Amino acid sequence: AVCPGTLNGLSVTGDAENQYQTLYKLYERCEVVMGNLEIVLTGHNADLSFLQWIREVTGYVLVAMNEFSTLPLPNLRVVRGTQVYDGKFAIFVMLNYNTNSSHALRQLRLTQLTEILSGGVYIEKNDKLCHMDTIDWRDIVRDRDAEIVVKDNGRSCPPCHEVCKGRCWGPGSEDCQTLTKTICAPQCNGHCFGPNPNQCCHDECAGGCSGPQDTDCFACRHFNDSGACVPRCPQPLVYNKLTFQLEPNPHTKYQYGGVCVASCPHNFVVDQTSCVRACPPDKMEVDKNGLKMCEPCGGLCPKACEGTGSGSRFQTVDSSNIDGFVNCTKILGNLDFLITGLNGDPWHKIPALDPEKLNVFRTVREITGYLNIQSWPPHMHNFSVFSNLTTIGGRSLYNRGFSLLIMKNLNVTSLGFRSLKEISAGRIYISANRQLCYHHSLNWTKVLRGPTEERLDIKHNRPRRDCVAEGKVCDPLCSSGGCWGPGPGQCLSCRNYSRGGVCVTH
C-alpha cells in the first residue's frame, strides 16, 4: 500500500510530458505518502486516477502551476504536516491557471479530508478555483495558530447545494464538507468523537475519531496495525511460559514509518525494529533463514579493501598508497612491503614512507592472500602494527606457494602478531632476519592447519642460544605453544586465565 513522496519544491524540467510521466511512476497505486505530495506544473490533459486510493500524507500537499480542472483526492482523510512547506503550510495551493488557455483549476475534490495535524493552508491566486471561501478551515486544522490564508481565487462561483448547509467543496450534493470539531469535554483533551465526557477518543488516535476505540481513529498517533492504532508494533520476542524465557514470536511485524508490516519493501532492510534503507553506521546486512537484518558490528563493520601485488596496481605499499587503507579491517588479496615502497625511489619520484603512517594497519584483522615483508622502518623492531591481525587465509600465494614471507629484516626483534591464530593455507617463510627471536618456541601446528611436514621454512634468524642468553624467551605465563614476543600480551595461549589479550595469574 504505502509508498514514498518528494522534496523538489517548485523545480522541474523542460518537458511537461515528462513532468506527468515521472509523477505517475512515483505515487503509483498508493495509500500512504511517506513524504510530501508535490503536484507542480502538471500536464493540462492529465488523467489523475492513481491518486484516488491515497488516504494520508505524512508531510504536506503542494498544488502549483497546474492546469487540470479538478484535483481528484477522494480517499484523502489525513494530512499530517510533520514536515511542512515554506514553513507554515500543510496545504499550499497557488497559481493554478494559464493565460493562453482556459485550462485552469476549478475544484478541489477533497470530499473526504477530515483534519490536518500540523500546519496552515494557503489558497491564493487561483483564478477559477471555486467554493474555498465556504469551507470551515479552522474545523480541519488542528493547530489554533497556524496560518489559514484563502483569497484571490474564483470570482463567479455557483452557490453551495442546500444539503451542504453553505459549506461545500463543489456544487454537488455529495461535494459537502462534513464538520469534524465539536469542542469538548475537559476529560477528552481535545480528542473526542462527540461533546460528551464518555465520548473520548482512544489514547492512540493522532487527531479525532468516530468512536472510543483503536480502529475508529482518523489517524494513528504512533503505528497502524491492520486497522488498529498502537504505540508499538508487535515485538519480535514474546515471553514464553514453557521455557521461562523469550522466543521468536511468529506474530511479529516490523515498523515502516507508521505501519506494521509482514515483510519490508523489495529494497529495504530490517534494523532491530524498523524497516530501513541502509544499515546504520554500526551494522552490516545478515541474511539467515529467509530474513535480512541489521546486526551491530561492535568494533568496526568490515571495511574490506584492495590488497597488493598480483591482481593490483601496486607491487608494494608505497607513500602514495598507504592512505588508501584507513580504518580498513579485512583485506582482499595481499600486502607487500618492499624495499622501494618504504624508502621510495627518486628515479620515479615516489617519496619515502612516513613510518608512523604504518599504524593504519592496526585496525586490520584478516588478510585473504599472503603477507610479505621484505623491509621494515628500522626504529620499529616488530610488527605490532599487525597486532590485531587474526587470520591469514593464503587464498593467493607469493613465490613458490608462500602464504606468509618475512625476509631480510635486520632490526626486527620479535614478530608481534599477538592476535594471529590462523594461517589457513600456504607455506610460511621467516628466514634471514638477523635479530629475530621468540619464534623458535612458537608451535606452528596450532596456527597453521592441514599438513605440517614441509610447510615451514624458518632459518638464519638470531640463533636460539643467543636469544636465550639475552633472556629473550616466552613469558612464564605462556603455554608451551610459544609466543610472538616478550611479556604476557604476546602469548599464543595462556596457562591460567586471559584478561583482554593479556595472560594473568588470577
Epitope: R400, M407, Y429, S431, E454, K459, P463, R465
Partner: antibody, heavy 121, light 108 residues
Framework: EVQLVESGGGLVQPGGSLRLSCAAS????????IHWVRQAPGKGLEWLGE????????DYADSVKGRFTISADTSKNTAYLQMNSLRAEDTAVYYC??????????????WGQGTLVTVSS | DIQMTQSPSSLSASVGDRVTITCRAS??????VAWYQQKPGKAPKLLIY???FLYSGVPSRFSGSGSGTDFTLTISSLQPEDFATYYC?????????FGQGTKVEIKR
C-alpha cells in the same frame, strides 16, 4: 631417490674465473638451503656460501666474500658457484650440499659427489 | 669467528673396541654441533645433529654427547667399515666452521 650432481670443475688459469653446476634431483629446492663446501686434497672442510631458493638470500665466508657469488635458478632446479679471481690456494674439491630439515641447525644431509678444481699455470 | 678443536688427529683401535672423539669449541655453542663421517673420496655423510641426535640410517653404535664447550662422539663397537675421517661441525650460525677431523683406522 634424493641426490645431487655437480660438474664443470677442472684446470683453470690463476686469476681466471669459473662456474660450477649443482643439479638437484629428488626434491624441490624452493625453500631448501643449498650450501657449498670445499676441501683441499690434504686438509679438511671449509664452508663457502649458502642460498635459500625462495627469496634468493646469500651469505659468504669472508675467505671468499666478494670474489665468489653463489646463485641458482628455480625453474631449472640447480645451484651455481661463480668463482672469480682464482688463487692457487683455491685448488680443492668443491661439494654442494643441502641443509637438514630437522632443526634450526645447518646440518647438511645430502651431498654431491664432488667436483675438482685445479688452479695452476 | 668460532674455533673448533678436534682431538686426536688420527687414532687406531681393534674391532669391537670403543672409540671416543672430542670437539672443543671457542665459545658456548649450547647444543648446535653436527658430526660427519667421510670415507676416502666420497662425500661426507652426516651422523649426529644437535650434539646428540642420530640421523635416519646410521647404526646405533655411533653416539654423541656434550653441551656448550665440550662435545663428544663415541663409536661403541668399532667395525672395519667404520674406517673414515670424522668431522665435528658448529652449525649455530654462519660461517660454519668444522674441526680439523679425526682420522680413524682399524687394528688387525
Amino acid at each position: 631417490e634424493v641426490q645431487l650432481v655437480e660438474s664443470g670443475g677442472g684446470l683453470v688459469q690463476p686469476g681466471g674465473s669459473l662456474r660450477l653446476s649443482c643439479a638437484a634431483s629428488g626434491f624441490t629446492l624452493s625453500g631448501d638451503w643449498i650450501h657449498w663446501v670445499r676441501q683441499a686434497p690434504g686438509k679438511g672442510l671449509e664452508w663457502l656460501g649458502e642460498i635459500s631458493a625462495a627469496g634468493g638470500y646469500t651469505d659468504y665466508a669472508d675467505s671468499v666474500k666478494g670474489r665468489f657469488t653463489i646463485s641458482a635458478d628455480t625453474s631449472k632446479n640447480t645451484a651455481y658457484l661463480q668463482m672469480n679471481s682464482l688463487r692457487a690456494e683455491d685448488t680443492a674439491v668443491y661439494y654442494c650440499a643441502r641443509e637438514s630439515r630437522v632443526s634450526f641447525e645447518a646440518a647438511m644431509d645430502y651431498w654431491g659427489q664432488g667436483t675438482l678444481v685445479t688452479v695452476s699455470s | 669467528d668460532i674455533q673448533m678443536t678436534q682431538s686426536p688427529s688420527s687414532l687406531s683401535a681393534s674391532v669391537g673396541d670403543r672409540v671416543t672423539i672430542t670437539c672443543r669449541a671457542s665459545q658456548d655453542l649450547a647444543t648446535d654441533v653436527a658430526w660427519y663421517q667421510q670415507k676416502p673420496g666420497k662425500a661426507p655423510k652426516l651422523l649426529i645433529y644437535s650434539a646428540s641426535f642420530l640421523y635416519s640410517g646410521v647404526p646405533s653404535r655411533f653416539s654423541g654427547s656434550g653441551s656448550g664447550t665440550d662435545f663428544t662422539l663415541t663409536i661403541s663397537s668399532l667395525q672395519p667399515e667404520d674406517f673414515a675421517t670424522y668431522y665435528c661441525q658448529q652449525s649455530e650460525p654462519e660461517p660454519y666452521t668444522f674441526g680439523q677431523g679425526t682420522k680413524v683406522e682399524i687394528k688387525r
